[PDB]
C-alpha cells in the first residue's frame, strides 16, 4: 500500500500464488489359479498269456 | 469262468474288489489271481 497529502502518494498490490497438484495412484492387481485333476483305473497282462 | 453268463441272465453288476489274488507285499499292489473264481 503506500498514501501521502505532500510527497509520496502511491498503490501497489504484487500479489503473486503457486499451486502444484500432483496426483499418482498406482494400481497393480496378480491373480494366478493352477489346479490339475487326476484319474486311475489299472490294467494287468494275465500271467499267462502268450 | 465267464460271469457274463448269468450277469446277463440277472441284471445285476458283478463285484468288483475280490479277494482270491495274490498281492504283492513290498510293493503293495494286487498282482494275479491265486484262488480261483468261478
Given amino acids: 500500500t503506500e498514501l501521502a497529502l505532500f510527497s509520496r502518494v502511491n498503490g501497489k498490490f504484487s500479489t503473486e500464488f503457486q499451486r502444484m497438484k500432483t496426483l499418482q495412484v498406482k494400481d497393480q492387481a496378480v491373480t494366478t489359479r493352477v489346479q490339475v485333476r487326476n484319474r486311475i483305473y489299472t490294467v494287468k497282462t494275465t500271467p499267462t498269456s502268450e | ?38
Fill in chain 2, 1 to 38: 469262468t465267464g460271469f457274463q453268463i448269468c450277469k446277463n441272465a440277472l441284471k445285476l453288476p458283478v463285484l468288483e474288489v475280490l479277494p482270491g489274488g495274490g498281492w504283492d507285499n513290498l510293493r503293495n499292489v494286487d498282482m494275479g489271481r491265486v484262488m480261483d473264481l468261478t
